[PDB]
Design a protein around this ligand. Structure first.
Ligand SMILES: [Mg+2]
Ligand SMILES: [Mg+2]
Ligand SMILES: [Mg+2]
Ligand SMILES: [Mg+2]
Ligand SMILES: [Mg+2]
Lengths: 188, 115, 135, 31, 76, 174
RNA sequence: GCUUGACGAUCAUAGAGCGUUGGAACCACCUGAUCCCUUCCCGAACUCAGAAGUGAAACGACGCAUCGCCGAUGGUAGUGUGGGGUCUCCCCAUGUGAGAGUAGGUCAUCGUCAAGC
RNA sequence: UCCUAAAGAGUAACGGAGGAGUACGAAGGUGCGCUCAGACCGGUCGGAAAUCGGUCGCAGAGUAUAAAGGCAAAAGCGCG
């Protein structure tokens, strides 16, 4: 996980569309805690390798603006709706001590053999994914493992069932709700 | 409370119509112990004359009677005429003009001040 | 077919079909989807020709969502009728599609059973629809 | 006001005015 | 069943914009029920029609609680 | 005089009893409302002036009549427009009317329990329905009509209804 | 500047919720209703005569961003004039540039006197 | 009165939707007072619902008469 950048001292609409067809570039910004926001050009080819990676969204990425180095986490992807490709990136500086909410993928690791599958009518319907995080950046949750190999038929899974290991909270439990996660039901 | 904001709801009609006419307002404030009176200039935020009971020549433990309030409105026209103030209005501030309110506003008409 | 139960009015203007689709272009429920890459409008009988194509190429399970709903009534004058004696009656109902909008979603199936199932539903729709995945 | 009518000759009389009109003046509870 | 029958368009609107100079009894706003309230030196007639009473320059300021629109005229 | 029974025995007792810090936290009775429901016989035009004269004697105070506020066609029309008769009792006629209850308005009921201890609102108010107008001094039996549906509703300065119980068990008749 | 009252200035970054805390000056509940006066019934409210008690309630201050409310930068939508194209829709040059969302903010700031330091 | 009507006025169609050809001597004036709907808990013959008490409200009620624009100095409600 490494990517290198440039400065982009040309703003607007007209100068921001000539980047995408002449040079194949993608705009970006770097805004953080203690500094100013700083715009940036990146290439469409180099973000394509990172966006193809699995856990690159919930992970720290280094950035070479010039020779300037910074540990950068990504929280946005504006994306072209019609054809489908990346537009400007809008990522974030990482301070060594700050609360830092982000989003984390799920896996549902062990559902080959379940009580609801092998005994009763076998269906497992994943409702939610991309559950958030609120954790210090010293420990990065790349993913959360959920196990539905023992949950029987007719039972659902809340957010209190799966856990958040080693100093990780859940924003939805900080509100007065507990969202359902996965169901096991009967096929038609 | 409950009583305090209901008489504030009763007071804002006449207090807002005296604002539009730009008249030197004579306000009042009754308590269960003693009675205030102020003359506020034509901007709502400037007090010209103000006589009370809590001054250091009148406190005697008998404030809270109708006879105590006659001297309050008596000794306030002498400070407004010393400030050169006539042509005033009388906001009763949600108080029913019957008892200690009305008796103070008769001492103003006696002491040369006129409405 | 799919149409509102009751309506606050009876007839509606024509309008236009402009812009792209910024909300509606993200897969939310399923893990595979058939999004539309050309603008048009769907006439609520094509939806049932495309629904009954996906719901017999699976026959085993999965779950189907229908993201789009027709609510715009359209008119049609009868024949041998001159123009200008009012406005014609409502014959059918129309949804309006613009590039990027997701039409159907599927989950709980294979990555290539579904790929050859949206081929059946795309041959009933008058639009050029592509194949996309959940991210 | 003055529109109301008291019967204070018996209202302000004795509650234990015998058990011959009140029918119970040594106990109030029948239970 | 058949439906033509519109009406004849009473010519409402706001006259005398934000920097004018007014006479004694000009018409400021032909209202339809108090989009604009009676500010400092204006009138508010029968059908809620703002009119002047003194001379000066129109302001169009937003004041106080409820965020209501007060049309005052300023001797400036 | 239950007021002189209140201040001397009940009022010092409850401050230590329910862990009350000062004087002014003690419960007491605010008012008594009755609300004789004449919702039966809407278009009667004969029973209201009877029902006023019924409640006129057992309280010693003139009632007021209560109109309606809708036309609930399933119940009745809005033509028989007065429906209710209500009396609010403040502090002078409170502790004197309260002595008729629980002393001589007990034996003429022919009941089992004088009042249930389960029916409360969440704040600490008690309500009760009395079936007959027979439980009353200075009343006729022959000239009275036995169509008198009467209620008793109590209001207390209680925060929650357990404090209503410790007040009600002092002058009790359950 | 600190204490309490009155009247304003400004209308939520000033709100709500939770917590905490104040007296014998102020204020509030309070005590009575004979005497003013009052209630489509009721001294509840209104009013009068007062200083047994209390700071409970109420009311101010003091804390908490949990709800609310404000809100960047960048990008994007749309659009004036001049030209384009495959022309029921878009694109180029140029001027203009939101809304939504993100980083984060917020437990207000003042003025006039009268009684306190 | 609303929409077509392009954020000043204006603006067509055998274009889409609705109303009027009146009431009122108080339904006018004025002074003085006072707040809605709805939910919910308790309460006798009513009960999904009548009258009463309570909390929650934060105009979702109301406006002689259509819809639009308004209404806490309430333009809404009561009294002399
Ligand atoms: Mg914005
Ligand atoms: Mg126009
Ligand atoms: Mg125009
Ligand atoms: Mg009217
Ligand atoms: Mg008024």
């Amino acid at each position: 996980f490494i990517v290198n950048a440039q400065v982009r001292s040309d703003l607007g609409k007209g100068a921001s569309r000539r980047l995408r067809r002449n040079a194949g570039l993608v705009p970006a910004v770097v805004y953080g805690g203690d500094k100013e926001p700083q715009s940036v050009t990146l290439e469409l080819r180099e973000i394509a390798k990172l966006l193809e990676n699995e856990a690159a969204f919930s992970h720290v990425i280094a950035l070479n603006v010039g020779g300037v180095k910074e540990t950068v986490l990504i929280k946005a992807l504006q994306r072209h709706p019609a054809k489908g490709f990346v537009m400007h990136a809008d990522f974030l500086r990482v301070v060594a001590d700050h609360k830092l909410t982000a989003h984390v993928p799920l896996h549902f690791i062990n559902e080959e053999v379940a009580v609801g599958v092998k005994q009763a009518g076998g269906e497992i319907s994943h409702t939610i994914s991309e559950v958030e995080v609120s954790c210090l950046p010293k420990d990065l949750p790349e993913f959360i493992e959920v196990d539905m190999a023992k949950v029987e038929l007719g039972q659902i899974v809340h957010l209190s069932d799966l856990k958040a290991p080693k100093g990780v909270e859940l924003v939805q439990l900080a509100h007065g709700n507990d969202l359902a996660v996965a169901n096991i039901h009967a096929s038609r | 409370s409950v009583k305090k904001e209901t008489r504030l709801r009763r007071a804002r009609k006449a207090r807002l119509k005296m604002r539009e006419l730009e008249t030197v307002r004579l306000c009042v404030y009754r308590s269960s112990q003693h009675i205030y009176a102020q003359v506020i200039a034509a901007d709502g935020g400037k007090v010209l004359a103000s006589a009370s009971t809590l001054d250091k020549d009148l406190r005697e433990g008998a404030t809270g009677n109708i006879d105590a309030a006659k001297k309050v409105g008596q000794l306030v026209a002498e400070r407004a005429k010393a400030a050169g103030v006539t042509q005033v209005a009388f906001d009763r501030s949600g108080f029913k003009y019957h008892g200690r309110v009305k008796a103070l506003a008769d001492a103003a008409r006696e002491g040369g001040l006129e409405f | 077919m799919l149409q509102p139960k009751r309506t606050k009015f009876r007839k509606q203007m024509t309008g236009h079909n402009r812009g792209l689709a910024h909300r509606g272009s993200k897969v939310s429920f399923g893990e595979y989807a058939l999004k539309a890459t050309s603008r048009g409008r769907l006439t609520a009988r094509q939806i049932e020709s495309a629904r009954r194509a996906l719901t017999r190429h699976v026959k085993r399970g999965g779950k189907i969502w229908i993201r789009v709903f027709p609510d715009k009534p359209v008119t049609k004058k009868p024949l041998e009728v001159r123009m200008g004696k009012g406005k014609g009656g409502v014959e059918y109902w129309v949804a309006q599609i613009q590039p990027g909008k997701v039409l159907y979603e599927i989950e709980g199936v294979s990555e290539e059973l579904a790929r050859e199932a949206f081929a059946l539903a795309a041959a009933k729709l008058p639009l050029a629809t592509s194949f996309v995945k959940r991210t | 006001k003055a529109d109301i009518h008291p019967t204070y000759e018996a209202i302000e009389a004795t509650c234990s005015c015998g058990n011959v009109i009140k029918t119970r003046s040594t106990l109030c509870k029948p239970i | 069943t058949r439906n033509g029958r519109d009406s004849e368009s009473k010519r409402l609107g706001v006259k005398l914009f934000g920097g004018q100079a007014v006479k004694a009894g000009n018409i400021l706003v032909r209202l339809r029920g108090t989009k604009f309230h009676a500010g400092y030196g204006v009138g508010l007639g029968k059908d809620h029609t703002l009119f002047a009473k003194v001379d000066g320059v129109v302001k169009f300021e937003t004041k106080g609680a409820f965020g209501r629109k007060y049309v005052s005229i300023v001797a400036a | 005089r239950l007021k002189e029974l209140y201040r001397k025995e009940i009022a010092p007792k409850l401050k230590e009893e329910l862990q009350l810090a000062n004087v002014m936290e003690v419960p007491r009775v605010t008012k008594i409302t009755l609300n004789m429901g004449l919702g039966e016989a809407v278009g009667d035009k004969k029973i209201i002036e009877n029902a006023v004269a019924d409640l006129e004697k057992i309280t010693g105070q003139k009632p007021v009549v209560t109109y309606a506020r809708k036309s609930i066609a399933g119940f009745k029309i809005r033509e028989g427009w007065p429906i209710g008769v209500k009396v609010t009792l403040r502090s002078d006629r409170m502790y004197e009317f309260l002595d008729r209850l629980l002393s001589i308005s007990l034996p003429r009921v022919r009941d089992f329990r004088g009042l249930n201890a389960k029916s409360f609102d969440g704040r600490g108010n008690y309500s009760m329905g009395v079936k007959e107008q027979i439980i009353f001094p200075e009343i006729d039996y022959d000239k009275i009509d036995a169509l008198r549906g009467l209620d008793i509703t109590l209001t207390t300065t209680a925060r929650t209804d357990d404090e209503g119980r410790a007040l009600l068990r002092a002058f009790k008749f359950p």
